[PDB]
Every structure is written in structure tokens, then in C-alpha cells.
């Protein structure tokens, strides 16, 4: 498994726990309704250790870029400014966010040809499945 195997455009096809995760993050009702009903594509590109992830939907589009292993300021979809680091470890892309004494982890992995995205904060979890799109 390598980080390049995650590259491409991926379309959300299933979600569990996302509203509960947004509630744990402190996200207000307007953004939570958006996130409940948006059907995003995620576009992952990686050039060596340079990673970009763009999330596109009719309701909201976000994008960040980073160098694997390097701490950077990420503005999240809900507007947090976190100290984030992304690494490819044990066959998964692991994204660690820290802000205001809080922390959340997001993992992305390839399983059966689908992109499986899992998030957690304070044991509140989400699982989102994306299928590869042309």
C-alpha cells in the first residue's frame, strides 16, 4: 500500500456518524445541515510528499495542501484553524488536527477499491465510504 493508491476523484456513497461528529466539533446548525445533505467528491493528488485534498460539492468546496510529515495551518470546512499533520503510515493516510487543546484524527484508506474515510474526536466516530469516479 502506498499514498499514490489514494489518488483520484472519489464520490461519497455512504455515511455513518457524521452528524454526531460535527456536533462533537461544535459545528452550528447551518453548517451541520449543509454537511448532512452535501454529496461531496474528494479529489486526492500526491506528488512525492506533496499532498492536496480538495472536497467539492454544490453546497461547499474546500481544499488544503501540505507536505507529508510537516505541521501546517489548516482551515477546516467548519472554519477551525488547526495545526495539522498528514502522514502515510501502516497503509493509511493519517491526518491529525490540534486546536484549542482539542484533537481529532481522520484516516483514509483503500479497501475493496473504495476509499474509506474515518474520523474521531473524543471517541465520537464517523465512517464515510467513497467510490472511485472518472
Is 9 annotated as ligand-binding?
Answer: no
How far apart CA 27 and CA 91 sit, in angstroms, is 30
Contact set with ligand 65X (CB under 6 A): 22, 27, 31, 34-35, 38, 40, 42, 55, 57, 60, 62, 77-78, 106, 117, 119, 128
Instruction: Output the smallest distance, CB 113 to ligand 65X, in A.
Output: 18
Is 106 annotated as ligand-binding?
Answer: no
Longest dimension (CA), the chain: 40
Nearest to 128 by CA among 62, 58, 38: 38
Q: Which residues contact 53 (CB under 8 A, 6 or more apart)?
A: 42, 43, 44, 63, 64
Instruction: Output the smallest distance, CB 97 to ligand 65X, in A.
Output: 9
Residue closer to ligand 65X by CB (options 31, 124) is 31
Amino acid at each position: 500500500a502506498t499514498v499514490q493508491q489514494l489518488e483520484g476523484r472519489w464520490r461519497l456513497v455512504d455515511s455513518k456518524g457524521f452528524d454526531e461528529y460535527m456536533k462533537e466539533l461544535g459545528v452550528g446548525i447551518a453548517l451541520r445541515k449543509m454537511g448532512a445533505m452535501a454529496k461531496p467528491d474528494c479529489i486526492i493528488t500526491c506528488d512525492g510528499k506533496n499532498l492536496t485534498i480538495k472536497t467539492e460539492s454544490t453546497l461547499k468546496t474546500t481544499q488544503f495542501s501540505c507536505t507529508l510529515g510537516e505541521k501546517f495551518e489548516e482551515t477546516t470546512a467548519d472554519g477551525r484553524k488547526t495545526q495539522t499533520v498528514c502522514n502515510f503510515t501502516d497503509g493509511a493516510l493519517v491526518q491529525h488536527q490540534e486546536w484549542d487543546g482539542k484533537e481529532s484524527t481522520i484516516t483514509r484508506k483503500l479497501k475493496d477499491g473504495k476509499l474509506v474515510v474515518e474520523c474521531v474526536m473524543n471517541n465520537v466516530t464517523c465512517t464515510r465510504i467513497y467510490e472511485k469516479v472518472e
